[PDB]
Design an enzyme around this catalytic site. Structure first.
Site, PDB file in Angstrom:
ATOM      1  N   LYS A  50      59.740  46.226  23.514  1.00 47.08           N
ATOM      2  CA  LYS A  50      59.061  45.436  24.540  1.00 47.08           C
ATOM      3  C   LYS A  50      57.749  46.073  24.977  1.00 47.08           C
ATOM      4  CE  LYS A  50      63.660  44.243  26.074  1.00 47.08           C
ATOM      5  NZ  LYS A  50      64.748  44.728  26.970  1.00 47.08           N
ATOM      6  N   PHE A  91      59.586  58.277  18.175  1.00 44.04           N
ATOM      7  CA  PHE A  91      59.987  59.586  17.682  1.00 44.04           C
ATOM      8  C   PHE A  91      61.431  59.890  18.132  1.00 44.04           C
ATOM      9  CE2 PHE A  91      59.696  64.059  19.577  1.00 44.04           C
ATOM     10  CZ  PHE A  91      60.428  64.636  18.544  1.00 44.04           C
ATOM     11  N   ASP A  96      67.278  59.936  17.352  1.00 46.98           N
ATOM     12  CA  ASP A  96      68.567  59.679  18.025  1.00 46.98           C
ATOM     13  C   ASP A  96      69.519  58.787  17.234  1.00 46.98           C
ATOM     14  OD1 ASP A  96      67.775  61.266  20.108  1.00 46.98           O
ATOM     15  OD2 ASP A  96      67.367  59.616  21.505  1.00 46.98           O
ATOM     16  N   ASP A 100      73.263  60.009  16.282  1.00 45.76           N
ATOM     17  CA  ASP A 100      74.511  59.382  16.653  1.00 45.76           C
ATOM     18  C   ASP A 100      75.019  58.402  15.609  1.00 45.76           C
ATOM     19  OD1 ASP A 100      73.161  56.911  17.255  1.00 45.76           O
ATOM     20  OD2 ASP A 100      72.559  57.810  19.169  1.00 45.76           O
ATOM     21  N   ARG A 105      69.081  48.984  15.434  1.00 45.87           N
ATOM     22  CA  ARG A 105      68.211  49.223  16.572  1.00 45.87           C
ATOM     23  C   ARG A 105      67.408  47.940  16.718  1.00 45.87           C
ATOM     24  NH1 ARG A 105      66.981  52.542  20.742  1.00 45.87           N
ATOM     25  NH2 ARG A 105      67.945  54.154  19.411  1.00 45.87           N
ATOM     26  N   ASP A 167      73.105  65.861  26.792  1.00 42.99           N
ATOM     27  CA  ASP A 167      73.914  64.714  26.450  1.00 42.99           C
ATOM     28  C   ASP A 167      74.860  65.002  25.286  1.00 42.99           C
ATOM     29  OD1 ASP A 167      74.579  62.076  27.208  1.00 42.99           O
ATOM     30  OD2 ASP A 167      73.546  61.322  25.430  1.00 42.99           O
ATOM     31  N   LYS A 193      66.678  63.154  30.057  1.00 42.55           N
ATOM     32  CA  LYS A 193      66.613  62.340  28.855  1.00 42.55           C
ATOM     33  C   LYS A 193      65.897  60.982  28.953  1.00 42.55           C
ATOM     34  CE  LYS A 193      69.445  60.370  25.254  1.00 42.55           C
ATOM     35  NZ  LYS A 193      70.805  60.095  24.730  1.00 42.55           N
ATOM     36  N   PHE A 232      67.213  52.632  37.141  1.00 40.98           N
ATOM     37  CA  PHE A 232      67.053  51.875  35.907  1.00 40.98           C
ATOM     38  C   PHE A 232      68.214  52.102  34.942  1.00 40.98           C
ATOM     39  CE2 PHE A 232      65.597  52.193  31.451  1.00 40.98           C
ATOM     40  CZ  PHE A 232      65.372  50.849  31.213  1.00 40.98           C
ATOM     41  N   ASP A 236      71.243  49.747  33.832  1.00 44.40           N
ATOM     42  CA  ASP A 236      71.357  49.537  32.401  1.00 44.40           C
ATOM     43  C   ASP A 236      72.822  49.752  31.954  1.00 44.40           C
ATOM     44  OD1 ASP A 236      69.804  49.174  29.811  1.00 44.40           O
ATOM     45  OD2 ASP A 236      70.712  51.130  29.433  1.00 44.40           O
ATOM     46  N   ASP A 237      73.492  50.761  32.507  1.00 45.77           N
ATOM     47  CA  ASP A 237      74.886  51.020  32.153  1.00 45.77           C
ATOM     48  C   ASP A 237      75.800  49.903  32.630  1.00 45.77           C
ATOM     49  OD1 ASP A 237      73.882  53.337  31.222  1.00 45.77           O
ATOM     50  OD2 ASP A 237      74.751  54.626  32.812  1.00 45.77           O
TER      51      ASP A 237
END
Ligand SMILES: O=C(O)Cc1csc2ccc3ccccc3c12
Ligand SMILES: O=C(O)Cc1csc2ccc3ccccc3c12
Lengths: 343, 343
Positions: A50, A91, A96, A100, A105, A167, A193, A232, A236-237
């Protein structure tokens, strides 16, 4: 809107960004194949999101620098710095997704999962990082805030990396140990993070470009922005589970990924010895049955209500922070950003 | 010797380096676990090599800066910058071992292959990178060559990454296509991936710290150092096969890894249609039988003789380059380094 209208000029500048970066093969045809690979890396990983963080650089710039001091070259530099922010994010995301083992994505296949890329994405991620500094040199070498931006980008990278380390330690790739899912750890992870590079970096960059290099001005803006960053990520969670895929535009899997989500942190504080065992035996499972079971324990604990309560108190706190720390900056800088985040 | 004696003070400074870096948990106990992980990353990956590149920073510094201007703080800064060089290398090695799936490094198990690390080594590699800039800020923030070193380290990283990209394109993880193993590609890979950060970076850093920031001085030193870098890597490839494990201290596997070695490049130019098929059907095999077969085709083509011839001509060329481009720098700076590389 402020973003919707500006988003066009920002995204179109990308062609120039790529051109200027792939212009190293000019006097060095020897590294041509490398430069072409670089162009593929950029066009695949920097485009498709976005662009809010990069856009926030441009928007904040217009509100901090006087109209006359906004010549074509100044806006050109602002678009570039905004793009450097997006590059810094590309990056992190590329790296990431590999760490993981993500499959997609933005609905699209993760760069490293592309046939012929694989672990080479590690070198691709380092290049995206390097392009940040190549662009700053190319466009802001002669500016008085040059070293400021370099240090800012370097510091943001370090913070983010530190936060990623935290994390990785908190939610391993095979340790559902809910013992470390504390609120203090959750806030630390979000701050390092996500908050620093997502909210402080963009505004701080516009600040330096506007000559606002004061340590106090930056510390005051940091206090506000880090708080928005925390909200935020908490929102988001919450939306990751109780959100509506139609509005959000994506399905959540924090529970299936044993993520140290704000929800699980809340559930751990609001759970009796028996409820704990229920979560300690359902958090991190692909079974849609075991997941729906989790969402159930959350609703029962009225977490959505807790979130709603937290949201209102959060909006109040942030408004108080803006009134107290915005000056001498235009409150709109923070208000415009908060309006986009809070519902 | 110049290095043997200085190597002691350099390696011992590491304890201070680690202390100063792990001193971020001071006013931030929240990221303590991350800082501890960082300390483990540093102590495992930055220690264990020969430290020649970092040492070259210190050695060159003493020869470029006047004896009186070499106070305790100046030497302290020189040790740190030298260590930043080692950190930059640790960053590359950790990431490169992952990309090529190596099992060991320096006889020791690759960091990422350690139980519990895995792909997290990607974030660990980024931290090693970040520590470079944290150290420069901590020790050279007030120095007039501060921005010079930052730009130098950033440029070296970019060069190396570009060179790694080129290397990944040249010798894929399943394409023994000897068509791209040309001498022009070989030289390009060595220049970007090895020469720049291994030979120019260390000396260039000492130069800036000594006030020698002239663009001509750096371009003259670059011409010399890049040439030594090329010879260094060519000799390294030769020794990888025809070298003596007792002296070198390691066994070579460039043939088994389908590496774009100088040897294979020479063999391709000195091979008839029939010989080509022999190599096109033996390069990149674990069979000790198929490998010994390759070494055979090399000897037959008298590559060792070619190397010997190249070495002598190389020593002559480099000596000519030193006599022509060393000034105003002390020729010893380059001569001391060349003496360590050439046999
Ligand atoms: O990037 C998003 O998807 C959230 C979002 C929606 S609109 C918007 C505006 C500014 C931002 C600054 C930093 C991070 C996010 C955002 C954001
Ligand atoms: O690092 C090595 O093992 C080769 C070596 C032996 S001694 C030595 C002295 C200076 C160097 C500078 C850059 C790269 C290598 C070296 C090197």
């Amino acid at each position: 809107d402020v973003y919707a209208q500006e988003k066009q000029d920002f995204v179109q500048h990308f062609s120039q960004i790529v051109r200027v970066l792939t212009e190293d093969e000019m006097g060095h045809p020897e590294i041509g194949d490398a430069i072409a690979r670089l162009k593929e890396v950029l066009e695949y990983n920097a485009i498709g999101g976005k662009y809010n963080r990069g856009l926030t650089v441009v928007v904040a710039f217009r509100e901090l620098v006087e109209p006359r001091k906004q010549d074509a070259d100044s806006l050109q530099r602002a678009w570039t710095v905004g793009w450097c922010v997006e590059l810094l994010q590309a990056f992190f995301l590329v790296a990431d997704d590999i760490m993981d083992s993500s499959l997609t994505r933005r609905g699209q296949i993760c760069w490293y999962q592309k046939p012929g890329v694989g672990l080479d994405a590690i070198n691709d991620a380092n290049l995206l990082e390097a392009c940040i500094y190549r662009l700053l040199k190319l466009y802001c070498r002669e500016q008085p805030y040059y070293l400021n931006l370099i240090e800012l980008f370097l510091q943001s990278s370090y913070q983010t990396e530190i936060g990623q380390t935290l994390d990785l330690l908190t939610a391993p790739q095979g340790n559902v140990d809910l013992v470390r899912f504390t609120e203090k750890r959750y806030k630390s992870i979000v701050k390092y993070k996500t908050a620093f590079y997502s909210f402080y970096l963009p505004i701080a960059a516009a600040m330096y470009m506007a000559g606002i290099d004061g340590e106090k001005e930056h510390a005051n803006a940091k206090k506000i922005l880090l708080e928005m960053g925390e909200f935020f990520q908490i929102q988001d969670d919450y939306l990751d589970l109780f959100g509506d895929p139609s509005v959000t535009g994506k399905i959540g899997t924090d529970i299936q990924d044993n993520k140290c989500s704000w929800l699980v942190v809340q559930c751990l504080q609001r759970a009796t010895p028996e409820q704990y065992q229920i979560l300690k035996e359902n958090y991190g499972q692909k079974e849609a049955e075991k997941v729906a079971r989790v969402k159930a324990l959350y609703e029962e604990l009225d977490l959505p209500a807790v979130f709603l309560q937290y949201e209102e108190d959060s909006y109040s706190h942030i408004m108080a922070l803006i009134e107290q720390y915005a000056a001498p900056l235009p409150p709109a800088v923070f208000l415009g950003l908060a309006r986009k985040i809070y519902k």
